[PDB]
């Protein structure tokens, strides 16, 4: 509908600021559109600041947090004191300013990021983008992000209190296709949690449910399970939902297909993203979104382990053929 001064198309006026604040952002926050830290740390902030939102603190008198209003970067002095916001501080800085150069809510901000930062990692889906967050928001209520060291029923009632049911939580966690840890064991400094830190596959999925094998550094951290092989790590909870009966086979049915994969994972960022706001309330921008190049890589059980190596949770249906890999057990580089 409307055409922006940089002569994009676009489909309401509202949207034509973020043709700039896409620019800014590629060239200088992901450092010439690159799927690197940046990324990973973007959809760590997205899921810690939507989360900070609670029904039960609402029903019960409480002030239970706004969701996703950007309110872990206006407030970033009281909620990344929180034990689960360590590592955050330079990348919210960093948006902080781009925010505040373009006049955007901080809220929003979050939101286009994760989109655009997405967009420069292979295999990802185009998400949706809506505008028009408020700017104003409280802090965040403590002891609303799920942590490494949680229960699976702990993170299902955390989760589904916010508003997500025990599959949703499934969905949303193929993030961690595209992710490392930093500070659970400082020994091994971005060690990846799958094979392909920088495409969002499905081989997170694939390789939290192979038999945990090796200790990938000098000791064990924080929340630190046995990986299935040197320079992986894997966190309990990750090791937990993938066999618990109650997302076993969610988790199995989200190995053998990139497609139904990146739909899902849409779908749940979608709820996400308005945690807290009226999505009718709304404007769309998603057209703004460029598209990510395409993984064109099958899913594989890595370095020879196959089938006899997954421990299937998923008692009624059988794992799916997966390929396999004709080689030795690979070594995993840190994460970029
Ligand atoms: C079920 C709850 C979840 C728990 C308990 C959890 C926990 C963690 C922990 C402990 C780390 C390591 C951080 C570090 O030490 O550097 C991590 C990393 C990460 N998580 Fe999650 N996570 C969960 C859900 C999610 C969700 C829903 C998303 C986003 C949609 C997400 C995205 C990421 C990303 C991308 C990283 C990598 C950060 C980096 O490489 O620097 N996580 N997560
Ligand atoms: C959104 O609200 C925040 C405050 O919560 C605004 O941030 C401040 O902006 C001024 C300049 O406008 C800076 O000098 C301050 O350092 C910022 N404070 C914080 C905590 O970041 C922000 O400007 C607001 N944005 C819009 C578009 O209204
Ligand atoms: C596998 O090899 C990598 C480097 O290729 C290490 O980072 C890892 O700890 C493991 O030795
Ligand atoms: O990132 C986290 N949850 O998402 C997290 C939670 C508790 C402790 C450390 C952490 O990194
Ligand atoms: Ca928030
Ligand atoms: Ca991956």
Redesign the pocket.
């Known amino acids: 509908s409307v055409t922006c001064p940089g002569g994009q198309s676009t489909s309401n006026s509202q949207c034509c600021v973020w043709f700039d604040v896409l620019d800014d952002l590629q060239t200088n926050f992901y450092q010439g559109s690159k799927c690197e830290?940046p990324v990973?740390?973007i959809?760590?902030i997205?899921?810690h600041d939507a989360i900070g939102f609670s029904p039960a603190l609402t029903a019960a008198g409480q002030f239970g947090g706004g969701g996703a209003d950007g309110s872990i970067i206006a407030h970033s002095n009281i909620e990344l004191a929180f034990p689960a916001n360590?590592?955050l501080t330079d990348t919210i800085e960093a948006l902080r300013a781009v925010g505040i150069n373009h006049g955007v809510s901080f809220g929003d901000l979050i939101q286009f990021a994760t989109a655009v930062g997405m967009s420069n990692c292979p295999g990802s889906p185009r998400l949706e983008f809506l505008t028009g967050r408020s700017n104003s928001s409280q802090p965040s209520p403590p002891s609303l992000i799920?942590?490494?060291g949680?229960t699976v029923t702990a993170?299902l009632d955390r989760?589904g209190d916010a508003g997500f049911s025990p599959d949703e939580?499934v969905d949303?966690?193929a993030?961690?296709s595209?992710?490392?840890?930093?500070?659970?064991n400082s020994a091994i400094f971005?060690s990846p949690?799958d094979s392909t830190?920088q495409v969002f596959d499905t081989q997170f999925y694939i390789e939290t449910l192979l038999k945990g094998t090796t200790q990938p550094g000098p000791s064990l951290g924080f929340?630190e399970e046995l990986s299935p092989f040197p320079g992986e790590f894997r966190?309990r909870?990750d090791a937990l939902?993938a066999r618990d009966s109650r997302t076993a086979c969610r988790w199995q049915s989200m190995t053998s297909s990139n497609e139904v994969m990146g739909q899902r994972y849409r779908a749940a960022?979608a709820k996400?993203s308005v945690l807290g706001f009226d999505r009718n309330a709304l404007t769309d921008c998603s057209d703004v979104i460029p598209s990510a190049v395409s993984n064109n890589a099958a899913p594989v059980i890595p370095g020879g382990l196959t089938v006899d190596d997954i421990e299937v949770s998923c008692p009624s249906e059988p794992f799916p053929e997966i390929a396999t890999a004709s080689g030795p057990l690979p070594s995993l580089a840190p994460?970029p």
């Open positions: 830290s990973r740390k959809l760590r997205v899921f360590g590592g799920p942590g490494p949680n993170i989760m939580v949303l966690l993030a961690h595209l992710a490392s840890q930093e500070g659970l971005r949690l830190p929340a966190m909870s939902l960022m996400m994460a």
